[model samples]
Target chain A: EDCQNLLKPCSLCEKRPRDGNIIHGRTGHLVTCFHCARRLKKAGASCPICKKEIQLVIKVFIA
Target chain B: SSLPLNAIEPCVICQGRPKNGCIVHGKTGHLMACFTCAKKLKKRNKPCPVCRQPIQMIVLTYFP
Candidate 1:
C-alpha cells in the first residue's frame, strides 16, 4: 500500500533525494530529512514548515 | 585586594561588561559566545561563528 509513502518530504530540501532517513517532528505533525531535522534542531527545535516547537523526532524507514 | 585585571572576563561581543549581564550559547561542540553577539547573529539568521552550525538555544550567562 501507499502507506509507506505517507511520510512527508523535507520542506527545506524538497527537490533533493533523501538517503532513506525520515524524521517526524516532536508532534509528528511535520516530517523532514535527517539533515534538515538536524539543522532545525540546531536552529531552536522548530519545524521549518509548520513553525511549531519541536522537542523530539521519530525515525521512519521506507524502501 | 582585587585580582589582576586579566583574571576577569568581559563580554566577548562589546568587549565591555554590561551592568545588566551577558548571554551565552553552545553553538558548536561546547563553544560559547556572548549574548549581544549571539542575538545579532540570530537576527541575521546566521550560524555559529566558530562551527557555522545553527543555534540550538540561547541562555543567559548572568542572572540574579
Candidate 2:
C-alpha cells in the first residue's frame, strides 16, 4: 500500500511544479515528489556522493 | 511535533539538531530527514542535499 501514490496517475507530472512545494533555483522552479526524488539520485542529475541535485534543488527549500 | 514560536525564520536553526520543548523536536517533528541542507550549511558541513545524506527541508508548521 505504500505505493498508493505511484499507482494513481499524477496529474502534474508533465505540468511542472505548480503547488507551493516548488523550490526556486537559479533556473527558476523545479518540481518533484518524494519518491521521484529517490530515482533522481542515480539519474546523472544528482550529486555523486550526496545525491542532492544542487543545480535543480533550491537552496531555499520549500518542502 | 510542536516547535517553538520564538525560533528564527528559515527554520533551519533547530530543525534536526534535536532538543526538547519544540514541535519539531520530538517524534512528530521527526517526520523529515535526520538533518537538512541548511543545517548542514550552518554547521559548515557540506553534505549532499540528496542521495548522500538526504536532507529534508522543513517547510513550516501547520495549525490545522
Candidate 3:
C-alpha cells in the first residue's frame, strides 16, 4: 500500500510528482511539480488548477 | 500549462520588463526579476530585493 501510494501519478503529467517533487501554495494547497511551479509562478503567483492566490510556495519532501 | 507572457512580473531590481530572462529567489516573497538584473546582483553578491537577505536559490522562469 505504501509503494502504491508512492506511485500516485500527477494530474498534469503521467510521471509521479510525489515526495520532494511536490509544491504547495501559501494557502497550504498542493500546487504542482517543479516544472508546473515555474509556470504558476509566472502566472502572477496564482494556482490555475485550484484558483488560489498564493502569496508564496514551498517545496515539501514526503520521501 | 503555458502562462501568458505578459503575466510575468517585472524585475524588482531594475524596474524593467523582461525580454531576455526572468528569475525568482526562494528567500523573497513575490519577488521576480529579469536575468540581466540577476546577473548584476550575482556579480555584486547582493541580497534579495524583497527580503534583503543573501539569495540562496534562483529559479529561472521560462516565458511562454
Candidate 4:
C-alpha cells in the first residue's frame, strides 16, 4: 500500500507531495507540494542570502 | 537560430520555455510538475477518480 501510493504521483503536479505543500493562495490554499513550494519561493521571491534575484536551476533526468 | 518562445512547460499556460518537472494538462503520468497540480487526495474526502470508489488506506508491509 505504501508503494502503491508511491506509484500514484500527486494527481495535480504528478510529482510526489511529501516534499510539497497545499499552499496559501487567493482561493485559500493551492495544494502545493513542498518541493515546488520551495522552488516557487526560491524562484519567485527575492533572495534572502544575496538579496538578489535567485537563479533557478532546472532538474534534469539523467540517463 | 532559436525559435520564438512558447508557453511554459509543466505550466499549462506559461509563455516561457517549459521548466523541468512540469507537464501539460492533458498529458498523463506524473514526473516534472509544479504546485498548481501536486495536491494529494486526502482520505475520507473523495473517491478514486477511476473506480469512483472510496479510497482506503492501510499500513504498508506491516508485520507482527
Q: Using lDDT as the measure, which candidate wins?
A: 3
Q: Whole-model lDDT, candidate 2?
A: 0.28
**lDDT: the better of candidates 1 and 3:** 3
> How many Å off is the CA of B8 in candidate 2?
19
Pairs of colliding residues, candidate 3: none
Write model 3 residue lDDT over B8-62, tens digit each, in one string.
3455556665422222345222224554666576568877555565654443322
| Per-model TM against the reference | 0.32, 0.21, 0.36, 0.21
- What lDDT tens digits, residue by residue, belong to model 2 across residues A1-63? 121221222233533321112222211222343334334533645532233453332222122
lDDT of 3 at A42: 67
Q: In each prediction, how many residue pairs overlap at the backbone (N, C-alpha, C within less than 3 A)?
A: 0, 7, 0, 19
For candidate 1, please provide the TM-score of chain A on its own. Answer: 0.49
Best by TM-score: 3
List candidate 3 stretches off by more than 4 Å.
A1-63, B1-9, B19-30
In model 4, how well does chain A match by TM-score?
Answer: 0.33
| Candidate achieving the largest DockQ | 3
> What overall lDDT goes with each candidate model?
0.38, 0.28, 0.41, 0.27
Query: Candidates' interface RMSDs, in order?
Result: 22.7, 14.4, 13.9, 17.3
True lDDT of residue B52, candidate 1: 60
If you assessed candidate 4 against the hidden native complex, which CAPRI class would it receive? incorrect
lDDT of 4 by residue, B1-64 (tens): 1111221132232323122222111211122222232223323354333334443321111000
Compared with the true structure, model 4 gives a TM-score of 0.21
